[PDB]
Amino acid sequence: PTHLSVDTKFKTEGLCVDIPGIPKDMTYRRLISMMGFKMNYQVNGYPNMFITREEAIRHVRAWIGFDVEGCHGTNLPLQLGFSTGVNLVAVPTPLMYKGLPWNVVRIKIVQMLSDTLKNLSDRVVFVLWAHGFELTSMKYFVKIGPERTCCLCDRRATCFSTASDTYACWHHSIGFDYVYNPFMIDVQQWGFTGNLQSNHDLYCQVHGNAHVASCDAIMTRCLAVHECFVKRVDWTIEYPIIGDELKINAACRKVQHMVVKAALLADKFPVLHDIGNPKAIKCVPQADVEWKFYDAQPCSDKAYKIEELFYSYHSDKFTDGVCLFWNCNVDRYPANSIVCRFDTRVLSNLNLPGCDGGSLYVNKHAFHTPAFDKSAFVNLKQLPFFYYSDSPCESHGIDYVPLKSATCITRCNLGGAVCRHHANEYRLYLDAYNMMISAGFSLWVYKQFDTYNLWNTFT
């Protein structure tokens, strides 16, 4: 049991206004046939156009919300809306395009999906709130068959070209006109009461209803993300490497060690309250400080209220020493904090649009993160870049240009001239730092933090 059986029942109540008289008793097998597709009893990797909720979650990077509204049924124009904000008008003869025949509309669909998905996934999952016209419009831009590979590479085929009779992945599909072997899921099958807008608006105020197909496409995908990543959370699901995941994660570990070690050296806190991941390890194992851990899983819905984390009776005195909130999203950080907070607004292949201002950050695991809020940091300041090292000035074991920098906090720089080892380490650290920042992470610190206090650790 890994794929959705074509013999599974499909509830047709949501389809009966666009498709009156539709049988109540319906399987995916009969629905696919009604949609104009023929599966021919084929054991060639594509057993069903529709997928399970579990398969959808594993392929969240492929999710594209899709809605079709009757602009005026083979006689009337249709408005095709996608969660990319694109609206296309197809004539049978928030971007809004004028009415065009299907032969040109399909070319645009292939281009749009290929540009959106080439760096995210090997497929497309059309996320629907199915009412009928979206399912019956698929025959005009979708072709199905056995699983195939690209004509220019080893990736699976996602597009087909009627001009050349060839197949391509999202990277090699320029000029292609058909979407090939797409996947889809109807959110209405999950058991909801009431329409799309009433269910979406229970959890999100950021997506409105401008009464266009793309607005519905966006709401449908948002509702699906809420159900699968906000109200339900699964950290056992692994996702493939598609970008700088490893470098970002290594950079995060380096920056955490650097910043915490320097805060302990500069202000000599007697106790550190480490709030967050219950599997956290001391990031500065050699520090003398009394290290105390507090368990809090990553919040996926709203940011934690500092009152619930700290109060209701632990050192108890979180006001003593310093608090470390490394990716532990809270409404308002205390003044004595060291913080790393993911900025949900960041544009990247790892960060997908989410629910209610939040974003779905996918790096090995999927983490829905509450919307970034500048007011959470009112008691702190932005942590400036610096590099600190107490290691001996010794090269050991890549060419050189001497380093001159006021932020290279080392014995050699204090002495007037940065050594080769600390210049190499400073540059590697600055690269790791910029990688983590560009990935969306923001760093905040207690207002008294001053790197000038680090120079006297060299005596």
Question: Interface with Zn ion by CB under 5 A: which residues?
Answer: 150, 152-153, 155, 169, 171-172, 204, 207, 222, 393, 410, 412, 419, 422
Q: Which residues share a beta bridge with 82? A: 66
Active-site residue numbers? 67, 69, 134, 211, 216
List the one residue out of 264, 31, 298, 273 whose CA is nearest residue 139.
31
Cα of 427 vs its chain's centroid, Å: 29
Give whichever of 82 and 310 is closer to Zn ion, judged by the CB atom. Answer: 82
Count of Cβ atoms closer than 10 Å to residue 140 Cβ: 18
- Strands 95-96 and 86-91, by their bridges, are parallel
**At its nearest, how many Å lie between ligand W0G and the CB of residue 394?**
19
Q: Is 3 annotated as a binding residue?
A: no
How many residues bind ligand W0G, per CB under 6 A? Answer: 8
Given 39, 237, 242, 287, the residue binding ligand W0G (CB under 6 A): 287
Q: Choose the one of ligand W0G, Zn ion, none that binds residue 399, judging by a C-beta under 5 to 8 angstroms depending on kind.
A: none
Q: Is 277 annotated as a binding-site member?
A: yes
Binding-site partner at residue 287 among ligand W0G, Zn ion, none, CB < 5 to 8 Å by type: ligand W0G
Told to check if 265 binds ligand W0G by CB under 6 A, we report yes
Supply φ then ψ for residue 423, to 5 degrees: -70, -45
**284 forms part of the interface with ligand W0G (CB under 6 A):** yes
Q: How far is the CB of 327 from ligand W0G (least distance, A)?
A: 21
Cα distance between residue 259 and residue 335, in whole Å: 16
Q: CA–CA separation, 2 vs 421, rounded Å?
A: 53
Sequence letter at residue 407: T
Q: How far apart are CA 408 and CA 153, in angstroms?
A: 46
Minimum CB–partner distance for residue 256 and ligand W0G (Å): 12
- Minimum CB separation of residue 268 from ligand W0G in Å reads 7
Closest CA to 138 of 188, 45, 71, 67: 67
Which residue lies nearer to ligand W0G by CB, 144 or 284?
284
Please choose, from the candidates 294, 390, 381, the residue with its C-alpha nearest in 3D space to the C-alpha of residue 338.
381
**Looking at beta carbons only, is 206 or 335 nearer to Zn ion?**
206
Q: Rounded to the nearest whole angstrom, what is the least distance from the CB of residue 410 to Zn ion in the complex? A: 5
Any known ligand binding at 150?
yes
> Binding marks (x or -) toward ligand W0G, 159..188, rule CB under 6 A?
------------------------------
DSSP 234-276: -TT------SSHHHHHHHHHHHHHHHHHHHHHHH--SEEEEEE
Nearby residues of 273 by Cβ (< 8 Å), 6 or more positions away:
292, 294, 315, 318, 321, 322, 323, 324
Q: Residue 284's binding partner, choosing from ligand W0G, Zn ion, none, with beta-carbon cut-off 5 to 8 A by kind?
A: ligand W0G
Helices marked H in 268-361 — which ranges?
A: 306-310
Block residue for tokens 């070690």: 261
Nearer to ligand W0G, 39 or 265 (CB): 265
Q: Which residues are annotated as a binding site for Zn(2+)?
A: 150, 153, 169, 172, 200, 204, 207, 222, 393, 412, 419, 422
User: Which residue ranges make up the annotated binding site?
Assistant: 67, 69, 134, 150, 153, 169, 172, 200, 204, 207, 211, 216, 222, 274-280, 393, 412, 419, 422
Residues that bind ligand W0G (CB under 6 A): 261, 264-265, 284, 286-289
